[PDB]
Design an enzyme around this catalytic site. Structure first.
Site, PDB file in Angstrom:
ATOM      1  N   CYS A 117       0.844  -1.070   0.002  1.00  0.00           N
ATOM      2  CA  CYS A 117       0.083  -0.054   0.007  1.00  0.00           C
ATOM      3  C   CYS A 117       0.855   1.306   0.000  1.00  0.00           C
ATOM      4  O   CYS A 117       1.391   1.709   1.080  1.00  0.00           O
ATOM      5  CB  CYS A 117      -0.985  -0.108   1.170  1.00  0.00           C
ATOM      6  SG  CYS A 117      -1.950   1.440   1.261  1.00  0.00           S
ATOM      7  N   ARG A 120       0.163   4.389   3.250  1.00  0.00           N
ATOM      8  CA  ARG A 120       0.265   4.290   4.517  1.00  0.00           C
ATOM      9  C   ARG A 120       0.511   5.484   5.503  1.00  0.00           C
ATOM     10  O   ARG A 120       0.577   5.151   6.515  1.00  0.00           O
ATOM     11  CB  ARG A 120       1.263   3.037   4.660  1.00  0.00           C
ATOM     12  CG  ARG A 120       0.795   1.639   4.454  1.00  0.00           C
ATOM     13  CD  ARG A 120       1.568   0.629   4.453  1.00  0.00           C
ATOM     14  NE  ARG A 120       2.681   0.471   3.486  1.00  0.00           N
ATOM     15  CZ  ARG A 120       3.683  -0.096   3.587  1.00  0.00           C
ATOM     16  NH1 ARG A 120       4.260  -0.672   4.770  1.00  0.00           N
ATOM     17  NH2 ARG A 120       4.704  -0.141   2.574  1.00  0.00           N
ATOM     18  N   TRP A 289      -9.200   6.420  -0.456  1.00  0.00           N
ATOM     19  CA  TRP A 289      -9.428   7.242  -1.493  1.00  0.00           C
ATOM     20  C   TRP A 289      -8.728   6.658  -2.643  1.00  0.00           C
ATOM     21  O   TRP A 289      -7.501   6.047  -2.179  1.00  0.00           O
ATOM     22  CB  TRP A 289      -9.668   8.734  -1.279  1.00  0.00           C
ATOM     23  CG  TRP A 289      -8.337   9.069  -0.665  1.00  0.00           C
ATOM     24  CD1 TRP A 289      -6.958   9.095  -0.973  1.00  0.00           C
ATOM     25  CD2 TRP A 289      -8.119   9.323   0.881  1.00  0.00           C
ATOM     26  NE1 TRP A 289      -6.102   9.584  -0.322  1.00  0.00           N
ATOM     27  CE2 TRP A 289      -6.755   9.522   0.804  1.00  0.00           C
ATOM     28  CE3 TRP A 289      -8.771   9.647   1.837  1.00  0.00           C
ATOM     29  CZ2 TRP A 289      -6.061   9.933   2.443  1.00  0.00           C
ATOM     30  CZ3 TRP A 289      -8.372   9.738   3.194  1.00  0.00           C
ATOM     31  CH2 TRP A 289      -7.001   9.955   3.154  1.00  0.00           C
ATOM     32  N   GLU A 294      -5.106   4.411 -10.478  1.00  0.00           N
ATOM     33  CA  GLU A 294      -5.856   3.184 -10.085  1.00  0.00           C
ATOM     34  C   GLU A 294      -7.335   2.892 -11.163  1.00  0.00           C
ATOM     35  O   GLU A 294      -7.421   2.001 -11.721  1.00  0.00           O
ATOM     36  CB  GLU A 294      -6.236   2.921  -8.617  1.00  0.00           C
ATOM     37  CG  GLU A 294      -5.125   2.782  -7.872  1.00  0.00           C
ATOM     38  CD  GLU A 294      -5.535   2.723  -6.236  1.00  0.00           C
ATOM     39  OE1 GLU A 294      -6.247   1.612  -5.992  1.00  0.00           O
ATOM     40  OE2 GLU A 294      -5.708   3.643  -5.501  1.00  0.00           O
TER      41      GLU A 294
HETATM   42  C1  HEM Z   1      -6.012   6.211   2.094  1.00  0.00           C
HETATM   43  C2  HEM Z   1      -5.640   6.248   0.948  1.00  0.00           C
HETATM   44  C3  HEM Z   1      -5.255   5.084   0.508  1.00  0.00           C
HETATM   45  C4  HEM Z   1      -4.546   4.759  -0.926  1.00  0.00           C
HETATM   46  C5  HEM Z   1      -4.204   6.132  -1.613  1.00  0.00           C
HETATM   47  C6  HEM Z   1      -3.916   3.566  -1.037  1.00  0.00           C
HETATM   48  C7  HEM Z   1      -3.447   2.936  -2.386  1.00  0.00           C
HETATM   49  C8  HEM Z   1      -3.300   1.660  -2.451  1.00  0.00           C
HETATM   50  C9  HEM Z   1      -2.785   1.187  -3.876  1.00  0.00           C
HETATM   51  C10 HEM Z   1      -2.528   1.889  -4.890  1.00  0.00           C
HETATM   52  C11 HEM Z   1      -2.535   0.048  -3.621  1.00  0.00           C
HETATM   53  C12 HEM Z   1      -1.898  -0.953  -4.741  1.00  0.00           C
HETATM   54  C13 HEM Z   1      -2.895  -2.176  -5.008  1.00  0.00           C
HETATM   55  C14 HEM Z   1      -3.702  -2.038  -6.547  1.00  0.00           C
HETATM   56  O1  HEM Z   1      -3.150  -1.200  -7.164  1.00  0.00           O
HETATM   57  O2  HEM Z   1      -4.583  -2.840  -6.752  1.00  0.00           O
HETATM   58  C15 HEM Z   1      -2.957  -0.448  -2.193  1.00  0.00           C
HETATM   59  C16 HEM Z   1      -2.824  -1.660  -1.704  1.00  0.00           C
HETATM   60  C17 HEM Z   1      -3.279  -1.799  -0.533  1.00  0.00           C
HETATM   61  N1  HEM Z   1      -3.924  -1.226   0.410  1.00  0.00           N
HETATM   62 FE1  HEM Z   1      -3.911   0.730   0.381  1.00  0.00          FE
HETATM   63  N2  HEM Z   1      -4.488   2.702  -0.166  1.00  0.00           N
HETATM   64  C18 HEM Z   1      -5.163   3.468   0.795  1.00  0.00           C
HETATM   65  C19 HEM Z   1      -6.026   3.300   1.839  1.00  0.00           C
HETATM   66  C20 HEM Z   1      -5.725   2.007   2.579  1.00  0.00           C
HETATM   67  C21 HEM Z   1      -6.628   1.641   3.686  1.00  0.00           C
HETATM   68  C22 HEM Z   1      -7.387   2.464   4.724  1.00  0.00           C
HETATM   69  C23 HEM Z   1      -6.225   0.321   3.940  1.00  0.00           C
HETATM   70  C24 HEM Z   1      -6.592  -0.847   5.077  1.00  0.00           C
HETATM   71  C25 HEM Z   1      -7.080  -0.409   6.150  1.00  0.00           C
HETATM   72  C26 HEM Z   1      -5.311  -0.225   2.731  1.00  0.00           C
HETATM   73  C27 HEM Z   1      -4.746  -1.378   2.855  1.00  0.00           C
HETATM   74  C28 HEM Z   1      -4.075  -2.156   1.586  1.00  0.00           C
HETATM   75  C29 HEM Z   1      -4.037  -3.288   1.170  1.00  0.00           C
HETATM   76  C30 HEM Z   1      -4.312  -4.289   2.393  1.00  0.00           C
HETATM   77  C31 HEM Z   1      -3.303  -3.563   0.120  1.00  0.00           C
HETATM   78  C32 HEM Z   1      -3.010  -4.760  -0.678  1.00  0.00           C
HETATM   79  C33 HEM Z   1      -4.177  -5.275  -1.233  1.00  0.00           C
HETATM   80  C34 HEM Z   1      -3.696  -6.282  -2.043  1.00  0.00           C
HETATM   81  O3  HEM Z   1      -2.728  -6.875  -1.849  1.00  0.00           O
HETATM   82  O4  HEM Z   1      -4.497  -6.581  -3.078  1.00  0.00           O
HETATM   83  N3  HEM Z   1      -4.881   0.802   2.145  1.00  0.00           N
HETATM   84  N4  HEM Z   1      -3.343   0.793  -1.746  1.00  0.00           N
HETATM   85  C1  LIG Z   2      -7.294  -7.320  -8.632  1.00  0.00           C
HETATM   86  N1  LIG Z   2      -7.153  -5.540  -9.003  1.00  0.00           N
HETATM   87  C2  LIG Z   2      -7.813  -5.777 -10.386  1.00  0.00           C
HETATM   88  C3  LIG Z   2      -8.147  -4.968  -8.145  1.00  0.00           C
HETATM   89  C4  LIG Z   2      -8.368  -3.514  -8.571  1.00  0.00           C
HETATM   90  C5  LIG Z   2      -9.191  -2.861  -7.788  1.00  0.00           C
HETATM   91  C6  LIG Z   2     -10.574  -2.546  -8.205  1.00  0.00           C
HETATM   92  C7  LIG Z   2     -11.553  -1.929  -7.046  1.00  0.00           C
HETATM   93  F1  LIG Z   2     -12.752  -1.429  -7.506  1.00  0.00           F
HETATM   94  C8  LIG Z   2     -10.884  -1.150  -6.194  1.00  0.00           C
HETATM   95  F2  LIG Z   2     -11.750  -0.644  -5.186  1.00  0.00           F
HETATM   96  C9  LIG Z   2      -9.453  -1.475  -5.826  1.00  0.00           C
HETATM   97  C10 LIG Z   2      -9.071  -0.963  -4.442  1.00  0.00           C
HETATM   98  C11 LIG Z   2      -7.541  -0.738  -4.093  1.00  0.00           C
HETATM   99  C12 LIG Z   2      -7.677   0.486  -3.232  1.00  0.00           C
HETATM  100  C13 LIG Z   2      -7.807  -0.086  -2.008  1.00  0.00           C
HETATM  101  C14 LIG Z   2      -7.837   0.984  -0.977  1.00  0.00           C
HETATM  102  C15 LIG Z   2      -8.247   0.838   0.318  1.00  0.00           C
HETATM  103  F3  LIG Z   2      -8.898   2.095   0.959  1.00  0.00           F
HETATM  104  F4  LIG Z   2      -9.375  -0.132   0.421  1.00  0.00           F
HETATM  105  C16 LIG Z   2      -7.386   2.116  -1.273  1.00  0.00           C
HETATM  106  C17 LIG Z   2      -7.049   2.595  -2.605  1.00  0.00           C
HETATM  107  N2  LIG Z   2      -6.829   3.886  -2.830  1.00  0.00           N
HETATM  108  N3  LIG Z   2      -7.122   1.625  -3.594  1.00  0.00           N
HETATM  109  C18 LIG Z   2      -8.814  -2.331  -6.534  1.00  0.00           C
END
Ligand code: HEM
Ligand SMILES: CN(C)CCc1cc(F)c(F)c(CCc2cc(C(F)F)cc(N)n2)c1
Ligand code: HEM
Ligand SMILES: CN(C)CCc1cc(F)c(F)c(CCc2cc(C(F)F)cc(N)n2)c1
Ligand SMILES: C[C@H](O)[C@H](O)[C@H]1CNc2nc(N)[nH]c(=O)c2N1
Ligand SMILES: C[C@H](O)[C@H](O)[C@H]1CNc2nc(N)[nH]c(=O)c2N1
Ligand SMILES: [Zn+2]
Lengths: 419, 415
Positions: A117, A120, A289, A294
């Site tokens: 993520c 963070r 958000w 994305e």
């Molecule tokens: C608040 C703004 C946040 C932003 C901009 C953000 C952004 C991202 C992005 C770009 C990814 C890459 C995964 C993808 O591209 O599909 C990611 C992964 C992830 N985020 Fe964040 N995120 C946010 C909030 C959070 C929150 C609130 C949580 C949990 C409480 C979280 C937990 C995770 C986890 C667990 C992954 C890995 C998920 C996976 O392996 O599919 N994120 N995040």
């Molecule tokens: C397996 N791949 C294709 C998934 C693509 C994908 C489709 C979606 F509709 C979608 F919501 C997401 C969230 C990732 C994400 C999660 C969070 C967290 F705050 F929850 C914040 C953020 N900025 N981004 C990923």
């Protein structure tokens, strides 16, 4: 030993010792690196169903030690009592319940340890909704609606997680079957093509198979498919006034709005598992958000997603006969200006990949400075466009697995015995 | 396990890697921490007799296997013959065939190289008879002229004598055979290529008379048999160069930009059968983004985003306009347009990555795997819209290999 990471744009070198607290295998060995495998390890910490005492308690003692260390207790009265409390509990129920303080600490620290993520920097500012008293699919719907409403906050988005009852015996799981709380249907056309979001074709069919009448459009918000205490899942329609949507327009190309594109404002992962002290919360929808890429790089331009590159390029009057014209690249940029200009104009929280990755570098600095490290998955942190002109591209990262954590889990339809 | 599996999440294709079982040397990761984004995870450290014996054996075994002569009379006598040399001379000499096979497979095994679909079409120049820096210059001029081929580029490698005691190494001190000088100004500005300022200083100190321009081709700094390095000027008619113009923007050529046609890495060590070839410059042709994204647009490099974005009349007061992204694309369009127009070989990042997926799949078919470094295979721009982004990869080290070695000015003992 101890390991340095270097940034090759700035020459800053950070010295990681936090990695010596990592517990689970990454999948790599001294001979093979699995850094680009999506799910490399199956190394859990507890197994299959209800664990025995020598399995659950040691993971429990570990988390309770970590939490009480966190607040400069440890060995204190409350810590020792809390240990004996968890111990009696596992003897009499084969599990235990977290205090409210422990639940909040664990959710935040699951977010803080999520190597993939980029977002963070905000980890400690996470609103936790405790829904462990929930008993039915209806109640999960009510909890999720309040989640979605609080989180959306009329566009000024806020971070939240809602935590449904932990797994007991593995046959009484709470699940959100939707992979994200708000996604668009994907329709399999008879002429072989696909209408809407192609990633959701299977889930959209389960919904139809469960009774959902699809409107059959390109941006149909899917119903929620909620499973409480192991029972058959139930369909629910999110009230649309709780689903904030942004129409995509371009600040220069007046014809862009005529593409009829929109996206929703709230990304909300709802198919992951939250692991704390050996407890497994199979239903823990969290949301935040978006990073503009994305939506505008992956959702809009993946070949197996919306795939709108050619049509945007056509409208742009681009030479699309050879790749070296870079027409895909040119359209890709314009789509991401569009997404950012739209969300910002409607005052919906969004962050670009430049500002987002700059903040992660700053977060890495903070984390080494006060925690001795920050696990970071380069392959997922670097944004899917303009990688090298973002600072993370030039930043070495160490990846390791800390607990508490978010884990993947099987999609419940591969698992669920119906009735 | 006897099988590891990799999946392409865009196509659902799944491949099975058996080849990683034959990997022998470290990746840098441990079972509990991955170092896949670390760029780099003694001179007297030349292999002993007992160290060298199994390395040679493994290599000769591999070679006779590849030509379907494993266990054969010629195989056993080669082994015997290599053993005797190690016993008697504490090293051994590759046959010409083995040298060619070794160098091709070092390229085949280069996990960070996206252009490996071409590995078997590699022209190998044997330069193990070279003894002086003048001789090295002669060899490298011929390499350049052969590889450049009037723009129709051909990949090649020139292999100088292997290491002996660590005290007589041959080295190209240059990092690439053709690079531009960088000059730091008293005011803190930088003229030319900022990446090359240190090596530019070494050359000037060695006696080089710098033109102090923006596209000064640097001289060769060649070290033979452990002696102090010597300067030579590549004859200017051998350095093919391309002026960078834009197919749509009249003004772009007015940036005065140009690049060279020939990418030629000269500071890496080729390891075959335990033998170390400390000087082994190799060349191919460019992928557009190496020049367009990294050479031109890294902040530590030519850093022309701001000038291009300005002439594009872009709003540069907030990042979310994506002016950097917009300028970066046009620069890369220009680089490709200009090479193609001058009929100089270049490959764009889409064709290159697509070819590498085909390559990988063939290597899984006929070889049982293909080690590959996703962090490096994925182009530095537009990553997700290229097919390698969606391709799981396994990374492991096979020998023969190309290795990093410390810069020569950090270890050389001046005479
Ligand atoms: C608040 C703004 C946040 C932003 C901009 C953000 C952004 C991202 C992005 C770009 C990814 C890459 C995964 C993808 O591209 O599909 C990611 C992964 C992830 N985020 Fe964040 N995120 C946010 C909030 C959070 C929150 C609130 C949580 C949990 C409480 C979280 C937990 C995770 C986890 C667990 C992954 C890995 C998920 C996976 O392996 O599919 N994120 N995040
Ligand atoms: C397996 N791949 C294709 C998934 C693509 C994908 C489709 C979606 F509709 C979608 F919501 C997401 C969230 C990732 C994400 C999660 C969070 C967290 F705050 F929850 C914040 C953020 N900025 N981004 C990923
Ligand atoms: C034929 C055209 C070729 C193309 C288009 C190509 C492309 C590339 C690219 C883009 C990289 C990443 C370089 C960077 O970003 O710094 C790379 C790395 C590499 N290439 Fe190739 N390459 C080609 C030929 C060759 C040849 C002929 C050899 C050797 C015989 C070779 C050996 C390597 C090695 C060892 C690396 C890794 C460099 C490192 O680890 O620092 N390549 N290649
Ligand atoms: C280690 N890294 C960080 C150095 C950066 C770097 C700067 C340069 F100026 C430069 F030319 C290169 C060439 C790589 C390369 C090599 C080859 C092969 F045929 F030789 C072909 C190709 N297309 N590219 C790399
Ligand atoms: C820190 C990171 O490992 C480093 O910047 C890498 C990233 N990937 C790369 N990929 C290529 N092709 N070339 C590079 O120089 C790098 N640099
Ligand atoms: C093959 C590779 O592991 C896969 O395509 C990964 C690469 N990096 C990613 N990075 C992000 N942010 N999101 C992703 O889905 C992926 N997918
Ligand atoms: Zn690894």
């Amino acid at each position: 030993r101890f390991l340095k990471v270097k940034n090759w744009e700035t020459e800053v070198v950070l010295t990681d010792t936090l990695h010596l607290k990592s517990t689970l295998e990454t999948g790599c060995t001294e001979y093979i690196c699995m850094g680009s495998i999506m799910h490399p390890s199956q190394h859990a910490r507890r197994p299959e169903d209800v664990a025995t005492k020598d399995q659950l308690f040691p993971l429990a003692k570990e988390f309770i030690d970590q939490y009480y260390s966190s607040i400069k207790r440890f060995g204190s009265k409350a810590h020792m009592e809390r240990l004996e409390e968890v111990n009696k509990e596992i003897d009499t129920t084969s599990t235990y319940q977290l205090k409210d303080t422990e639940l909040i600490y664990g959710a935040k620290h699951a977010w803080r340890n999520a190597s993939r993520c980029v977002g963070r920097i905000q980890w400690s500012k996470l609103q936790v909704f405790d829904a462990r008293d929930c008993t039915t699919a209806h109640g999960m719907f009510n909890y999720i609606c309040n989640h979605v409403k609080y989180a959306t906050n009329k566009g000024n988005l806020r971070s939240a997680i809602t935590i449904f009852p932990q797994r007991t015996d593995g046959k009484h799981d709470f699940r959100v079957w939707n992979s994200q709380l708000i996604r668009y249907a994907g329709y399999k056309q008879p002429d072989g093509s696909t209408l809407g979001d192609p990633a959701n074709v299977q889930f959209t069919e389960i919904c139809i198979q469960q009774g959902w009448k699809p409107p059959r459009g390109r941006f149909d918000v899917l119903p929620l498919l909620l499973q409480a205490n192991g029972n058959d899942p139930e369909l629910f329609q999110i009230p649309p006034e709780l689903v904030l949507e942004v129409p995509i327009r371009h600040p220069k190309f007046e014809w862009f709005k005529d593409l009829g594109l929109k996206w929703y404002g709230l990304p909300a992962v709802s198919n992951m598992l939250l692991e704390i002290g050996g407890l497994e919360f199979s239903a823990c929808p969290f949301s935040g958000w978006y990073m503009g890429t994305e939506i505008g790089v992956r959702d809009y331009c993946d070949n197996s997603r919306y795939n709108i590159l050619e049509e945007v390029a056509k409208k742009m009057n681009l030479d699309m006969r050879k790749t070296s014209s870079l027409w895909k690249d040119q359209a890709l940029v314009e789509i991401n200006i569009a997404v950012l200009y739209s969300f910002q104009s409607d005052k919906v929280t969004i962050v670009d990949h430049h500002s987002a990755t700059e903040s992660f570098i700053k977060h890495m600095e903070n984390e080494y400075r006060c925690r001795g490290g920050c696990p970071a998955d380069w392959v997922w942190i670097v944004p899917p466009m303009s990688g090298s002109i973002t600072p993370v591209f030039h930043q070495e990262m160490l990846n390791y697995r800390l607990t508490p954590s978010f884990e993947y889990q099987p999609d419940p339809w591969n698992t669920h015995v119906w009735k």
